[PDB]
Design a binder for this molecule. Structure first.
Ligand code: SIA
Ligand code: SIA
Lengths: 165, 165
């Protein structure tokens, strides 16, 4: 019956809905207040240096203060995680499975994850006996067909390397 | 069993994991490719003026070309949705349940959702009998104790106004 959070297999709610302390999605104090697990918590969840390096759920920005939110106060000056307004360099894996482009910037979409993708959620990164025993980055699994990814198709039967089974 | 997407009650995957066409979380072509429902799809999901105004799942940015992603190309110049780098004015709701601050900026966190919050996922916007019949915004439900919100705690038993069930 649970929807989200520790009760719901780590799932997030859609459209910034807060995950209550009991693992259901909604807005208002019962969801976003004390115990809020993810979404638009109020106050924002603690993050970055102020929470042992934990990133914000739902790709919220981690403020200079170490709270999760959106707006200039969170994503602008002093932003330490999430979709900060500053370009994010990599080479230092991108946080939260963002793709490190060939040019060493973090992002998502084909410009980052496609041709030349170094690491993160790359579209099509080869591995295993199909790619000279090449290893996957980010501790992903090498699927039977020699593609890097996560989930049953890559970590399940036929898995060549990484955290198989 | 299912984790995400239509099959998983509209849940999102954590850490930008892609929701496959079958409603499971992962990375690689099976999850992020054709039929990808959310997360770091490759290519990014269509959005904005290229998807009938649909916003990106997981607070991804909608590029000027109508694809979901992160990075300068998506959040920077031409961004039409998500956590664009430009400040977003309001007064005129915010998208994706973002709070409209008393000053007329969209965001999340106390500076937006706290005192003076006009709309969206406000921390503690009073309503109903406790607020002299005041109505909630965003078609939220007024809970029994007179706070605006969504979910069973606000739209369920005791719901005063809004789309009670
Ligand atoms: C996919 C990627 O890395 N794109 C980055 C590009 C590339 O480095 C190209 O080399 C420059 O066009 O550089 C930027 O400064 C840019 O021009 O916007 C940031 C952008 O995120
Ligand atoms: C890409 C994807 O969603 N794969 C999932 C598959 C698909 O649902 C079936 O291949 C559809 O026929 O089912 C699993 O139980 C599996 O076989 O391990 C989980 C796995 O994550």
């Amino acid at each position: 019956a649970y929807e989200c959070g520790k009760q719901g297999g780590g799932a997030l709610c859609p459209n910034n809905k807060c995950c209550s302390r009991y693992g259901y999605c909604g807005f208002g104090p019962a969801y976003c207040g004390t115990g809020c697990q993810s979404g638009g918590c109020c106050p924002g969840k603690r993050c970055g240096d102020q929470a042992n390096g934990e990133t914000c759920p739902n790709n919220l920005c981690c403020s200079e203060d170490g709270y999760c939110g959106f707006g200039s106060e969170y994503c602008g000056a002093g932003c330490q995680g999430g979709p900060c307004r500053a370009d994010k360099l990599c080479g230092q894996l991108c946080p939260d499975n963002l793709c490190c482009s060939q040019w060493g910037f973090c992002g998502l979409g084909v410009e980052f994850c496609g041709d030349g993708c170094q690491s993160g959620a790359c579209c099509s990164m080869r591995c295993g006996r199909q790619a000279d025993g090449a290893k996957c980055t980010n501790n992903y699994c090498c699927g039977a067909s020699g593609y890097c990814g996560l989930g049953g198709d890559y970590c399940g039967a036929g898995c060549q390397s990484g955290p198989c089974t």
